[PDB]
Design an enzyme around this catalytic site. Structure first.
Site, mmCIF file in Angstrom:
data_model
loop_
_atom_site.group_PDB
_atom_site.id
_atom_site.type_symbol
_atom_site.label_atom_id
_atom_site.label_comp_id
_atom_site.label_asym_id
_atom_site.label_seq_id
_atom_site.Cartn_x
_atom_site.Cartn_y
_atom_site.Cartn_z
ATOM 1 N N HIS A 1 0.829 -1.203 0.000
ATOM 2 C CA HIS A 1 0.000 0.000 0.000
ATOM 3 C C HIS A 1 0.864 1.254 0.000
ATOM 4 O O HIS A 1 2.020 1.223 0.424
ATOM 5 C CB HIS A 1 -0.931 0.077 1.271
ATOM 6 C CG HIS A 1 -0.221 0.520 2.544
ATOM 7 N ND1 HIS A 1 -0.145 1.844 2.927
ATOM 8 C CD2 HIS A 1 0.386 -0.190 3.521
ATOM 9 C CE1 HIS A 1 0.518 1.933 4.076
ATOM 10 N NE2 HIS A 1 0.843 0.712 4.463
ATOM 11 N N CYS A 2 0.281 2.368 -0.468
ATOM 12 C CA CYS A 2 0.925 3.667 -0.166
ATOM 13 C C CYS A 2 -0.200 4.616 0.236
ATOM 14 O O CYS A 2 -0.825 4.358 1.263
ATOM 15 C CB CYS A 2 1.792 4.166 -1.325
ATOM 16 S SG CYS A 2 0.867 4.159 -2.957
ATOM 17 N N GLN A 3 -0.530 5.650 -0.551
ATOM 18 C CA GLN A 3 -1.577 6.621 -0.195
ATOM 19 C C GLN A 3 -2.642 6.625 -1.288
ATOM 20 O O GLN A 3 -2.565 5.843 -2.244
ATOM 21 C CB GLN A 3 -0.980 8.028 0.004
ATOM 22 C CG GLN A 3 -0.161 8.071 1.302
ATOM 23 C CD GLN A 3 0.497 9.414 1.499
ATOM 24 O OE1 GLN A 3 1.539 9.689 0.904
ATOM 25 N NE2 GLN A 3 -0.084 10.245 2.374
#
Ligand SMILES: CC(C)(C)C(=O)CSc1ncc2c(n1)-c1cccnc1CC2
Length: 150
Positions: free
Chosen positions: A90-92
């Site tokens: 995941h990131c943003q």
């Protein structure tokens, strides 16, 4: 928040940072590994001792090198694979960093062209924000795979 932990492969899931906080859904999907592709988001559930966390400390910028982390990410994805556990990367919002890594994984380890791997991921996770720098790194990576250099 209603988490969308997008299944790319049976054990490989893509999401943003709200998705990465949904502990119940993560456990329900047998996720045992988390790749956090950011410099600044928490390892949200680290203190619970439920997931093997890895940080790839990257910003979503026009100068960030993500290629340098591809092999590290691939090895960790293969650990989850052989362990029979799921992995969330995941990131943003817009998932530019985590989707780049997923696309690169598909290219190298599932023998997909860059375009096919991008369209495959976008067919499952329709919103993927652009990063022209990361596009170019996928293009260099594709060229290196086709020349046998990686
Ligand atoms: C690198 C990253 C996955 C974060 C994105 O930039 C997503 S957004 C976007 N927009 C236009 C194009 C592409 N991506 C793109 C990526 C890979 C291959 N072919 C294309 C065709 C043009």
């Amino acid at each position: 928040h209603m988490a969308e932990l997008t299944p790319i492969l049976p054990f490989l899931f893509l999401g943003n940072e709200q998705d990465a906080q949904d502990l119940d859904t993560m456990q329900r999907l047998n996720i045992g590994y988390v790749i956090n592709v950011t410099t600044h988001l928490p390892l949200y559930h680290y203190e619970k001792g439920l997931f093997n966390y890895k940080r790839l400390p990257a910003t979503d910028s026009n100068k960030q090198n993500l290629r340098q982390y591809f092999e590290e990410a691939f090895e960790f994805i293969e650990e989850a694979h052989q362990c029979g556990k799921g992995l969330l990367i995941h990131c943003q919002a817009g998932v530019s960093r985590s989707a780049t890594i997923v696309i690169a994984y598909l290219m190298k380890h599932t023998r997909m062209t860059m375009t096919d791997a991008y369209k495959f991921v976008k067919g499952k996770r329709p919103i993927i924000s652009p990063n022209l720098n990361f596009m170019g790194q996928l293009l260099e990576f594709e060229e290196d795979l086709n020349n046998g250099v990686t």
